[PDB]
Symmetry: C2
Subunit: 189 residues, 2 copies
């Protein structure tokens, strides 16, 4: 329950998380969407789904500290159990990253989903998904195929988080009771 999702531009990964709560695939509601850009079509998707958005573009702010003091304020209003970055595109800061520790998540390409931390590595990866270099590469495909894996795996890890079976304990990810190791994935032991 209590998912808040940060985003910039178009929102394909967010679509995937609104339909997965909608259909009860993740036990939680996405209680608000934020973007550091107006234009962000992912906003149009949040309002079609009828969820509260908040574009906070900087330049409206005097400093970066000012802006993140504020983004943390409008985010914590919604009492978030998870804060999921899903295309957000802003250089995160020691205070943001520290504020949401163990409830902050991100997705990066090739495609994988990790806990965001201060560790030099970016923080523990939770779930990875490799896509073939296999020949029917109707070039657009390159990314478009990673995208499909993104829409598949981010809802699945957010869902484990909600059901209380993904914890981050001591800069290590922990699925269903035991430690994930550097690349992690499924049925536990």
């Amino acid at each position: 329950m209590n998912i808040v999702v940060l985003i910039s531009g178009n929102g394909s990964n967010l679509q995937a998380i609104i339909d997965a709560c909608k259909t009860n695939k993740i036990k939680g509601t996405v209680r608000a969407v934020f973007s550091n850009k107006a234009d962000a079509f992912g906003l149009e998707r949040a309002r079609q789904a009828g969820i509260a958005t908040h574009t906070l573009i900087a330049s409206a702010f005097d400093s970066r500290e000012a802006y993140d003091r504020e983004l943390i304020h409008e985010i914590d209003m919604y009492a978030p159990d998870v804060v999921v970055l899903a295309g957000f595109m802003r250089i995160l800061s020691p205070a943001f990253v520290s504020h949401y520790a163990g409830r902050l998540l991100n997705i990066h390409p090739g495609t994988s989903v990790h806990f965001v931390t201060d560790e030099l590595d970016g923080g523990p990866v939770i779930l990875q998904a490799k896509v073939p270099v296999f020949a029917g590469d109707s070039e657009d495909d390159i990314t478009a195929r990673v995208q499909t894996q993104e829409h598949a795996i981010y809802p699945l890890v957010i869902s484990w988080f909600a059901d209380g079976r993904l914890k981050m304990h001591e800069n290590a990810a922990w699925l269903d009771g035991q430690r994930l190791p550097p690349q992690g994935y499924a049925a536990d032991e």
Copy 2:
């Protein structure tokens, strides 16, 4: 000059103001657009035109005291010279109105725009326009003749304000020094 418009729906009014300031008839700028409602199309108008949306849903707040304290907080970062309500369906507090004093404008469907001075939507009217109903109009045919006056009258009145020509000294709307009559109008006679 720094405008923020508060909305709850289609936003065609938001749009006349965005257009009027774009084509310079208002000497000002729409810094942000706020909303009590998650799905209000006028939010889409604000995104196509580049303006930062912000939407606070009453049910995310526990006390109405809290909603208003938050909505004022978030309007103030934009530092508004005039905050214009355009379709905002919310019952306002004294504290919200007290706070935006003679900077808060409101419009109504017969058309009369006015200074909101009191938590039961009272204040000095600045300008009135009456529309003709003819033999055979439909309720739509009327409502749109009305909509078109709001789009012609609300901007013009924000022009006079964002030009110093309009001010409000003790529940009295004054344009150029002269206290306006209770029906508004703008010149004399």
